[PDB]
Amino acid sequence: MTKITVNYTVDVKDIQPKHVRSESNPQNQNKIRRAWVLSLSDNAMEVIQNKIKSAPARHAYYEAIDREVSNKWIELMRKHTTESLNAGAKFIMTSCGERLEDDYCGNADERLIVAAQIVAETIAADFNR
Amino acid sequence: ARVTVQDAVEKIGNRFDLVLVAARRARQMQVGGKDPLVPEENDKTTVIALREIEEGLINNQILDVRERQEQQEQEA
């Protein structure tokens, strides 16, 4: 709809612990959706409401966007592993499985928010037609 | 007849394959195909087979060689 879509992406202030959940156990989900919401503004809400007139279709495209951000986040972890290995990282075998070295390790929250911001920019570009 | 299986246990130490071979012997004396090698007293095939095994007349070697040979003569 709107030729310009305001974004809340690539902000330095967008780094904060995404561990919000109202029930037990803080692992994945209840944060991924919040992550890729925090990268989008309300203008996205109005644009999707005008473009799509079906609530089940809207929910399906929300799930599609969530799968896209998950795929891009997985791409981010594999890229981080590849660049760490190119930087001389070693596979640390702890009693939790595989990890990288401390000086080579990243963190999931920053990768997740970067993925969310980039996908939000992609969606904003998608609204520009 | 015979009531004690001590001699058969001495012949066949495992005494589990002893049950198998005794059953085999007793079944094909009960079901047509052969006749006992120890004379009868109107006894069932069980004690007859036991008395055979005590005398060392029937064991796994004798049984399977007899089966082999009867297969060659029956086949041609």
Binding site: - | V19, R27, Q30
Partner: protein, 99 residues
């Protein structure tokens, strides 16, 4: 009391019913362990499958003994079939790894 052939349940082929011919005596799991302690291995199979549950086994073995020999059919006891069916009745699958 004793019996050889007579009444059977309409839910299973275990022998029970009335007192005109009461069912066979209840050879419980304790006596199954008693047989297991021996090398009593076939005896369990006859006393659980052909003499107790397998209706096809019961008929075949009765015909065999009447015919003048003591031979057995292995059989598939109906008790396990009942357990299988009612496990399947709750939406929990049971299947057979066919040989």
């Amino acid at each position: 009391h004793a019996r050889s052939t007579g009444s059977y349940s309409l839910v299973t082929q275990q022998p029970l019913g009335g007192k005109a011919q009461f069912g066979g005596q209840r050879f419980g799991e304790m006596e199954v362990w008693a047989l297991e302690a021996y090398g009593a291995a076939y005896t369990l199979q006859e006393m659980l499958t052909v003499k107790s549950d397998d209706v096809n086994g019961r008929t075949k073995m009765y015909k065999n003994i009447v015919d003048g020999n003591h031979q057995m059919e292995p059989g598939m006891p109906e008790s396990f079939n009942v357990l299988l069916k009612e496990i399947r009745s709750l939406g929990i699958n049971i299947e057979l790894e066919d040989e």
